[PDB]
Design a protein around this ligand. Structure first.
Ligand SMILES: CC(=O)N[C@H]1[C@@H](OC(=O)NCCCOCCOCCOCCCNC(=O)O[C@H]2O[C@H](CO)[C@@H](O)[C@H](O)[C@H]2NC(C)=O)O[C@H](CO)[C@@H](O)[C@@H]1O
Ligand SMILES: CC(=O)N[C@H]1[C@@H](OC(=O)NCCCOCCOCCOCCCNC(=O)O[C@H]2O[C@H](CO)[C@@H](O)[C@H](O)[C@H]2NC(C)=O)O[C@H](CO)[C@@H](O)[C@@H]1O
Ligand SMILES: CC(=O)N[C@H]1[C@@H](OC(=O)NCCCOCCOCCOCCCNC(=O)O[C@H]2O[C@H](CO)[C@@H](O)[C@H](O)[C@H]2NC(C)=O)O[C@H](CO)[C@@H](O)[C@@H]1O
Ligand SMILES: CC(=O)N[C@H]1[C@@H](OC(=O)NCCCOCCOCCOCCCNC(=O)O[C@H]2O[C@H](CO)[C@@H](O)[C@H](O)[C@H]2NC(C)=O)O[C@H](CO)[C@@H](O)[C@@H]1O
Lengths: 170, 171
């Protein structure tokens, strides 16, 4: 299942999540009731939608609609994989990258070893620095949960029993 | 309920990692060894370097065939996903299809949204929903989409199952 019926799961290759939480293509999926993917009626995002982000890594246009191509990812792009470089980190007042993108040592948002590897400042860093009581009490970035084992992440093993800090369950 | 191979190739929201066990999260247990999609610490391979495989989660395929985001991945040499360069398609570019079900606009560019998927859309996830099959003079869908017994194009058991007239029907 996808969307609401499956913890916000998204379909592969821009397939549409129907109102019943099934992946497909055509009116019964992409038409009325479409939850995510290549929905015929584009989702709202950005300033026009209270800062809401686009699903499926779609770009948020200057008009607050989700999609792909120059009109969405080009000039005035508000979110998603915008064509413009996106600044983050201590170079930009500690600004986080949206959608868990990694902030590189240089203060740019992205994914891949150049971003998530050595010097990664926030997001889905691969550096896996220890947190919690055995790490001076370092809290994770992005409000990620610090597990009882002193590692940062999201999931029952991080946010559940023994969660030391972050988005711990409650 | 599950992601990855445990959940019909399902993908996590917001680049969350699908663990080797088909659950969504962040950190080593999900993004580390066994990660299936999302922000895997070891980026998936794509493009020419990997048999033309496309990146999951709509990540960019860099010139070197690794999945990710940023100028290094979506900029110069980008082979797939939301590349920064405009992507040509349709009659303007020899009837080329768009990847990942993206719509080919009236102008022959790949994208998503009404400008691309609306009037004049040539292939991909067009919202124009033009008829197919016995009542459309035997016309077939683009992208090898299934034509349902009802005469509409799509993918799913209602389109590809019983009564399927053309496309990638079941069997
Ligand atoms: C779409 C979806 O999520 N379907 C599911 C889902 O199906 C439902 O639960 N269906 C509940 C429906 C009650 C009412 C919907 C009518 N849709 C319709 O008429 O679609 C056709 O016309 C449209 C144009 O008006 C066109 O856009 C569509 O493509 C047409 N659909 C086909 C199949 O030709 O669950 C099933 C499991 O039980 C599952 O196997 C199935 O894949
Ligand atoms: C982006 C956005 O948020 N769009 C909204 C918004 O949509 C619009 O506002 N649409 C207005 C239609 C666009 O008309 C505005 C004029 O644009 C000026 C530029 O010239 C227009 C035609 C030439 N553009 C063109 O041919 O673009 C193509 O080629 C370009 C290369 O030159 C390429 O960069 C573009 O990506 C191409 N665009 C397509 C669709 O192929 O509201 C809609 C209704 O709620 C909504 O559905 C839509 O999602
Ligand atoms: C939580 C923690 O702190 N993990 C650490 C820690 O990780 C480990 O100690 N891993 C040990 C691997 C053994 C056998 C285990 C099966 N567990 C399982 O199936 O859990 C899943 O299923 C559950 C439902 O049954 C579901 O609720 C869980 O979310 C699932 N967990 C995953 C990871 O998918 O150290 C790592 C580096 O030293 C670090 O990167 C990692 O973040
Ligand atoms: C990371 C970053 O912030 N890049 C920024 C940043 O870029 C720079 O600062 N670039 C200037 C030089 C970078 O600083 C040099 C030190 O960093 C070294 C990083 O290591 C790069 C080594 C080459 N990597 C490589 O080949 O990766 C490929 O193979 C890897 C191993 O298999 C694999 O993990 C990668 O995924 C591969 N990369 C790609 C793109 O496929 O600012 C730019 C604006 O000025 C901005 O556009 C750019 O996005």
């Amino acid at each position: 299942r996808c969307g609401e019926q499956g913890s916000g799961m998204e379909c592969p290759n821009n397939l549409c999540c129907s109102q019943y939480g099934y992946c497909g293509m055509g009116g019964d999926y992409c038409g009325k009731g479409c939850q995510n993917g290549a929905c015929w009626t584009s989702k709202r995002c950005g300033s026009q939608a209270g800062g809401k982000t686009c699903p499926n890594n779609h770009c948020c246009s200057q008009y607050g609609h989700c999609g792909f191509g120059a009109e969405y990812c080009g000039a005035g792009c508000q979110g998603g994989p915008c064509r413009a470089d996106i600044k983050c980190g201590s170079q930009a007042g500690g600004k986080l990258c949206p959608n868990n993108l990694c902030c590189s040592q240089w203060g740019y948002c992205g994914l891949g070893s150049e971003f998530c590897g050595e010097g990664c400042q926030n997001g889905a860093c691969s550096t896996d620095k220890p947190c919690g009581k055995d790490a001076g009490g370092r809290v994770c970035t992005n409000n990620y949960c610090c597990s009882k084992w002193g590692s940062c992440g999201i999931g029952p093993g991080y946010c559940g029993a023994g969660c030391q800090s972050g988005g711990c369950d409650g």
